[PDB]
């Protein structure tokens, strides 16, 4: 209650961030234990990414929330342990991490209720924007790099699934991470229960060797390329398709096999800055030890440039979706 | 249409049982208990209408006590298929949720009946293409009913539901335009045999679907047969290994699988 606010003061916030974090924690106190009966459905905000997500209204509080339904057939002991492990999200309060309200099990589905973001996922944003301007991909990078270091220092956790559909954005210009691996039992449960069409998985994780947050950096770099150009890059673009996006399909196994055997993708030269190119090249190093780590990324030239550039992110977002 | 189309006012939908990405399963009432699988498709294309009547034609050819009883279909308001209602749960729920304490003679009987149903389908030139323990239902606990076959016509239309645990390596790699065969079905049956004879799912120490897809397609991973029950007959252990073999042509067919179990059953 105020144990949450004490952990706010252990973070390096600015004036406008502490305003919003303190406003969200007070709204967390309006809601108690959540149940399926407490919610009124508004709209539908997603269909893939491991379960349907609804925009909903919590009747007792009036709050608007995002409700992720994850359908899984698991024995009741695992259900309760998944809900126990998800409670660490009450303590995950950061400007770069979407908020949590509560989790419960109903029917055959784990419901996760979390902060609503009217901007949606950058996956959804990308399909309206065509490609994302580089200036903004600089601001997105910072948000991701900061969210990963927050998780590793304040929680000792990795994201384990950094992709465009797990980065959400707000009309307030906030860029936050979501759907990270808090519950080890939920991690096990969702490997057996879903299938994938594409992959942002690091080659060392595909091969079963030891991995760290470096795998998430590889996923960030792969996501940045996919947002820079308007296409998933594992099958590198044709000599024609490049000349169809700037002017002057493989099955899941063939993708995973490509990520392990063939050189990583690169940003097409000439259309993007040199530093941004070097940035993704340092993220997509196959050997994790010689890949850039989190502190090197924060002092890379592309980030110090982008951090200083005052951009109207909130503005561009409301212009490109409405 | 044909005489298996059911008018919607005759069916009363009750409770919701399961919900994948391709449809939703409700318990219902239509001359007694019934199961209705309603497809998530509101704008069915003339193409998808034909694939549905084609898959219904395949369902129309199955009459066997180990195959789920097709009962009718609905094509106007929505696309749905009506089948019998099984009083037990799926084999997956028995083994992995309730953890029901089957004895060794019951596990072999479930294995034999499943092989009996699969033999019937192949004898009618039907490939299941998606066999798992989710699709094996125990009517009142004693007799297995195989379902979720067919509609592979309509299923081929980011992260949906489904699983890779039962997929044959040739099916995982998808290198052929049609890697599906009687032996890809045998591999899936083999994984169900593994479930039956260990009580748990394969690759329990790997928790990354993309790792499983890569490792199994390359041949670096395979079901850990050291977890088979100690009371599992040594001929049954051989049958798991034979069905799970990486080479598609090295796997037994179901007439042999049946015989292997029948002679084992003569204690
Ligand atoms: C692809 N990588 S993987 O390691 O194989 N699998 C998994 N990776 C990550 C994660 C998981 C499992 C997992 C999911 C899917 C999840 C989704 C929403 C959520 O809610 C939430 N609310 C507020 C803020 C942030 N999250 C919490 C979540 O916790 C989890 O542990 C993997 F199963
Ligand atoms: C003749 C087979 C038709 S099918 O292959 O389309 N499969 C199918 C069609 C409709 C269904 F309702 C089902 C199904 O899931 C069940 C059928 N009977 C059941 N009894 C219990 C449970 Cl839990 C589930 C079911 C099902 F597997």
Author numbering:
A (entry chain B): 30 to 277, 307 to 380
B (entry chain A): 339 to 495, 503 to 612
Show the paper's wording.
We cocrystallized the CRAF:MEK complex with PLX4720, a type I.5 inhibitor that is a close analog of vemurafenib. Crystallization was facilitated by inclusion of CH5126766, a MEK inhibitor that is known to stabilize RAF:MEK complexes. The complex crystallized in space group P6522 with two essentially identical copies of a CRAF2MEK2 heterotetramer in the asymmetric unit (RMSD = 0.715 Å). We refined the structure to an R value of 23.02% (Rfree = 0.2639) using data extending to a resolution of 2.91 Å. The structure reveals clear electron density for both PLX4720 and CH5126766. In this structure, CRAF forms a back-to-back dimer, with MEK1 bound to each CRAF KD in a face-to-face orientation as previously seen in active-state BRAF and CRAF complexes with MEK1. Unlike prior structures of CRAF2MEK2 heterotetramers, only one CRAF protomer adopts an active, αC-helix-in conformation. In the other protomer, PLX4720 binds an inactive, αC-helix-out conformation that is essentially the same as that observed with binding of related type 1.5 inhibitors to BRAF. In the opposite protomer, however, it exhibits a noncanonical binding mode in which the pyrrolopyridine scaffold is flipped and the compound adopts a compact C-shaped conformation such that the propylsulfonamide packs below and adjacent to the pyridine ring, forming hydrogen bonds with both the active site lysine (K375) and the main chain amide of D486 in the DFG motif. This altered pose is sterically compatible with the active, αC-in conformation of CRAF.
pmcRAF family kinases (ARAF, BRAF, and CRAF) are the first node in the MAP kinase signaling cascade and are responsible for phosphorylating MEK, which in turn phosphorylates ERK. Active, GTP-bound RAS recruits the RAF:MEK:14-3-3 complex to the plasma membrane, resulting in the formation of active RAF dimers. The RAF and MEK KDs interact in a face-to-face orientation, allowing phosphorylation of MEK upon RAF activation. Crystal structures of CRAF in complex with type I.5 inhibitor PLX4720 reveal an asymmetric CRAF dimer with one CRAF subunit bound in the inactive state and the second bound in an αC-helix-in, active conformation with an altered inhibitor pose.
